[PDB]
Design a protein around this ligand. Structure first.
Ligand SMILES: CCNC(=O)Nc1cc(-c2nc(C(F)(F)F)cs2)c(-c2cncc(C(=O)O)c2)cn1
Length: 192
């Protein structure tokens, strides 16, 4: 297996997200949502909140374990490896974003790393705050790169329908959508 940097994604976006129109834009949402859904599927967290922000960016927040906050080789945080080395969802989204923030809560601490310009770290993984020990999760916010996509307008109805489906397949997990551009909001939850 040959590892690559994020320029490989930026040079062939369609190989990773299919297209660079609205279909491809929304694939970015699906990759991050799927990581939250995978964590919920393993039993960590019972809500996944998606927000379309006024500035055009998109947030997905889970209440799972939190991504690991330790170091890889050479003092590089694990999180930075996940987001900056292509082996895949997190790194592909980072590559195709003009900026991305990951915020992790676990062990009584809140950490954040920020990337800009297609995934270049502008900070390390730094502790920015504290939280109760019981609090855990990951929050990813990303601004899709307007120089790559022909549209950067997230579609509330499109995300809504996908989250509803995902909620039906997961069971016993709340998926919520808020649009800060229009104030629209909906929640989905299916018991079994
Ligand atoms: C809003 C997006 N939400 C979101 O990415 N949540 C998330 C991702 C991971 C990921 N971790 C990794 C890596 F690489 F660290 F394992 C990749 S994704 C974990 C996690 C936490 N502990 C252990 C594991 C594991 O699989 O062993 C996985 C928890 N929440």
């Amino acid at each position: 297996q040959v590892l690559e940097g994020l320029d490989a994604v930026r040079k062939r976006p369609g190989m990773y997200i299919g297209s660079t129109d609205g279909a491809g834009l929304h694939h970015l949402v699906w990759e991050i949502v799927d990581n939250a859904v995978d964590e919920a599927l393993s039993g960590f967290g019972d809500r996944i909140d998606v927000t379309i922000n006024k500035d055009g960016s998109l947030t997905v927040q889970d209440h799972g374990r939190g991504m690991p906050t330790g170091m890889h080789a050479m003092g590089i945080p694990t999180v930075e490896v996940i987001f900056t080395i292509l082996h895949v969802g997190s790194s592909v989204v980072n590559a195709l974003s003009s900026w991305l923030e990951v915020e992790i809560t676990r062990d009584g601490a809140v950490y954040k790393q920020r990337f800009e310009n297609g995934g270049k770290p502008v900070t390390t993984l730094k502790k920015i705050g504290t939280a109760l020990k019981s609090k855990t999760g990951t929050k990813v916010t990303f601004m899709p790169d307007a120089t790559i996509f022909s549209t950067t307008d997230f579609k509330y109805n499109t995300i809504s329908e996908r989250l509803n489906e995902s909620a039906f397949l997961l069971k016993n997990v709340t998926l919520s959508l808020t649009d800060k551009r229009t104030d629209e909001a909906i929640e989905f939850h299916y018991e079994n």
